[PDB]
Amino acid sequence: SGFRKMAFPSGKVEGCMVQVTCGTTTLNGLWLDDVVYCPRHVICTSEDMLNPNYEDLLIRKSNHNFLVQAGNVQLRVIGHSMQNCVLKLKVDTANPKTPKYKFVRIQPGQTFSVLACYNGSPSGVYQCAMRPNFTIKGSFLNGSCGSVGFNIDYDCVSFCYMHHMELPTGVHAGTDLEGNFYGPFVDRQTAQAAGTDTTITVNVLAWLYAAVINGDRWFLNRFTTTLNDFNLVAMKYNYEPLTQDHVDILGPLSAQTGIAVLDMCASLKELLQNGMNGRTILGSALLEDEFTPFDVVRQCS
Amino acid sequence: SGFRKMAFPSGKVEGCMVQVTCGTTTLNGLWLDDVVYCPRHVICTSEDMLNPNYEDLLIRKSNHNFLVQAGNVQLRVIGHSMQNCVLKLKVDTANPKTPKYKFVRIQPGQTFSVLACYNGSPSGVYQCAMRPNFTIKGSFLNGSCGSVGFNIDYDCVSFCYMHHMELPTGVHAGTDLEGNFYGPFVDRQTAQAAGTDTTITVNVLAWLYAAVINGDRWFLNRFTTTLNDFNLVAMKYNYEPLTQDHVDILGPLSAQTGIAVLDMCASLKELLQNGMNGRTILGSALLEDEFTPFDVVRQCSGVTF
Ligand SMILES: *CCC(=O)N(C(=O)[C@@H]1CCOc2ccc(Cl)cc21)c1cncc2ccccc12
Numbered sequence: 176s177g178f179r180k181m182a183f184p185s186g187k188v189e190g191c192m193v194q195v196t197c198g199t200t201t202l203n204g205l206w207l208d209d210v211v212y213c214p215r216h217v218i219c220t221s222e223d224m225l226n227p228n229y230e231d232l233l234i235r236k237s238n239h240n241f242l243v244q245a246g247n248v249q250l251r252v253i254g255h256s257m258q259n260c261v262l263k264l265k266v267d268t269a270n271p272k273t274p275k276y277k278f279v280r281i282q283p284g285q286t287f288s289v290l291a292c293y294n295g296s297p298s299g300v301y302q303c304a305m306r307p308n309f310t311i312k313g314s315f316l317n318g319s320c321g322s323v324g325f326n327i328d329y330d331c332v333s334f335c336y337m338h339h340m341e342l343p344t345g346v347h348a349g350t351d352l353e354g355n356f357y358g359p360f361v362d363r364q365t366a367q368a369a370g371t372d373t374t375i376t377v378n379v380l381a382w383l384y385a386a387v388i389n390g391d392r393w394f395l396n397r398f399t400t401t402l403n404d405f406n407l408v409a410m411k412y413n414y415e416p417l418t419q420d421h422v423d424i425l426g427p428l429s430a431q432t433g434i435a436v437l438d439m440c441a442s443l444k445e446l447l448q449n450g451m452n453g454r455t456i457l458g459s460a461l462l463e464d465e466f467t468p469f470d471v472v473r474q475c476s
Numbered sequence: 477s478g479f480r481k482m483a484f485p486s487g488k489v490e491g492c493m494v495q496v497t498c499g500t501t502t503l504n505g506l507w508l509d510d511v512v513y514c515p516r517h518v519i520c521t522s523e524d525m526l527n528p529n530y531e532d533l534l535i536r537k538s539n540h541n542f543l544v545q546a547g548n549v550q551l552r553v554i555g556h557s558m559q560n561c562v563l564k565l566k567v568d569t570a571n572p573k574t575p576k577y578k579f580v581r582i583q584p585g586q587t588f589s590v591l592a593c594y595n596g597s598p599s600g601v602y603q604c605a606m607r608p609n610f611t612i613k614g615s616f617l618n619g620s621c622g623s624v625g626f627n628i629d630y631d632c633v634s635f636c637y638m639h640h641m642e643l644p645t646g647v648h649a650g651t652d653l654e655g656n657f658y659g660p661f662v663d664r665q666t667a668q669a670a671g672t673d674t675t676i677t678v679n680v681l682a683w684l685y686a687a688v689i690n691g692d693r694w695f696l697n698r699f700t701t702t703l704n705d706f707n708l709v710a711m712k713y714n715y716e717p718l719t720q721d722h723v724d725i726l727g728p729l730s731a732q733t734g735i736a737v738l739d740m741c742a743s744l745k746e747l748l749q750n751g752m753n754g755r756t757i758l759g760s761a762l763l764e765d766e767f768t769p770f771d772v773v774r775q776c777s778g779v780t781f
């Protein structure tokens with residue numbers, strides 16, 4: 176029993192973290208086989224902050240300009256190329272600790288673990304969700320760029336995120352491992368702002384099912400609702416609308432607890448209307464939205 | 477910016493997790509050098525847990541009864557002994573992935589990372605605090621026994637907890653790596669209950685400092701208080717009393733933010749007597765008490781391991 180926000184064990188990812196230095200900028204790189212992946216902004220100078228031409232900056236670089244350090248060993252850069260906003264540094268040594276891995280692009284609402292690093296050294300691991308506005312609410316300081324987000328599929332590491340920037344509101348933006356940003360963000364110092372964040376409704380419902388599995392039933396009610404009426408109410412509380420895909424995904428939890436999805440939706444509508452009234456659900460006074468239906472099944476089984 | 481509940485990177489500990497099987501019971505073991513540590517209740521089955529004489533049960537067991545598996549490799553048990561509630565299985569192979577380590581006993585309020593495992597395989601890592609009632613509010617299923625709690629300082633792993641049991645309220649109990657339980661618990665199937673839990677006051681104060689470092693200042697007020705006045709109020713809300721040791725430990729955060737400890741105590745006293753008023757602190761509607769002052773400095777300054 177018990178329900179915790181749990182990250183994946185980070186060992187497989189720690190053995191891939193290296194330090195990448197280019198001029199006066201130092202950040203983290205992900206060393207997989209003979210390639211080190213890192214944010215392309217590691218090549219930016221003091222004048223290319225607002226309008227960098229990364230293709231123009233990278234052409235002017237040589238392999239000897241990139242300092243890559245894996246622990247106490249300096250790796251030799253033998254090639255460099257750019258794929259979108261990620262720089263790929265070909266090195267002369269394959270990482271012997273390279274786990275089984277894949278690069279995945281995730282959707283909003285998906286969760287993942289972040290191994291926060293500084294100077295190529297892992298400092299902490301936490302759990303995140305890709306917000307509906309495509310930002311992540313991380314904990315990153317200067318020098319955390321190149322830290323990665325991942326999930327672990329049995330023995331396989333699925334890399335889904337690489338950290339690039341902090342927006343003015345303190346939220347974070349980054350790319351998948353092919354260098355494509357999540358959201359309408361650019362690796363430029365131009366005025367950028369995240370859209371208004373909304374609650375991941377499907378994840379709140381999954382967490383209410385986790386609470387019922389763990390014995391917490393006080394918020395249940397005898398009502399049901401149509402999907403359209405639930406969406407109309409939920410959108411007024413800045414909750415994401417729930418699609419038929421989300422209803423189907425909650426099916427196994429609905430079958431496990433004996434509470435239909437639309438019955439649980441009526442509990443959620445009531446919670447939004449009344450608040451908690453001094454009560455907590457799974458030790459929380461707010462509705463938690465960073466547990467997916469898959470996370471709930473995995474942790475409760 | 478940002479403030480998350482963050483665990484230590486678990487790699488150094490994952491390389492020590494093995495599976496220990498004795499009869500029909502399978503749980504986790506911690507393989508350090510040529511010794512595998514695990515809960516001694518692995519030698520129990522059905523009648524054994526009701527009234528166990530662990531010394532009598534262990535004497536009857538042979539080395540070959542213990543099946544130890546490290547990944548896809550079976551380790552051979554060449555000796556066995558018991559230290560309190562932990563079983564130590566001497567193996568014929570030293571763990572090549574043994575990190576620099578020490579066994580430490582922690583105090584209530586102290587936090588640590590838990591590497592939750594099943595069948596010797598790490599499945600998740602989470603951060604928690606040793607509650608004042610000596611339980612931990614973990615997330616553990618059957619087969620999680622033997623999972624360990626740890627901290628990392630520099631490149632040194634300090635093992636502070638080993639999981640043994642779940643109490644009827646869903647909270648968890650375990651021992652240090654010398655087999656001594658945290659709290660008034662015993663490793664026997666008998667009626668046991670945790671004492672009433674209290675809030676780790678020094679940790680709430682550290683988390684309020686983390687909130688200020690991150691820009692959340694709505695709860696700050698012009699007032700200060702005495703340690704005596706604060707403790708009298710706090711103890712009525714089931715908060716742990718704050719000692720001069722706790723005030724000194726918060727010193728660096730008080731210097732960094734310009735909010736003296738007793739100044740922050742006055743904010744906390746108002747937060748208890750008046751509530752949040754619909755507001756949140758670091759995205760939370762409750763006061764968080766599972767971040768120590770050291771955790772806050774570490775996360776808000778980027779110390780690496
Ligand atoms: C490697 C850190 C870094 O680059 N951070 C930024 O957000 C940059 C600051 C200047 O503006 C900017 C524009 C575009 C891009 Cl892609 C990056 C930046 C950064 C990332 N995470 C956390 C941070 C905390 C404090 C300062 C900078 C941070």
Ligand SMILES: *CCC(=O)N(C(=O)[C@@H]1CCOc2ccc(Cl)cc21)c1cncc2ccccc12
Nearest residue numbers: 176517616617618619621640641642663664665
């Ligand atoms: C390794 C699992 C286990 O032993 N768990 C227990 O709590 C035992 C259940 C029977 O009573 C008992 C008495 C004393 C001791 Cl030391 C252990 C037990 C166990 C541990 N964590 C989570 C669990 C979840 C569900 C069942 C059993 C759990």
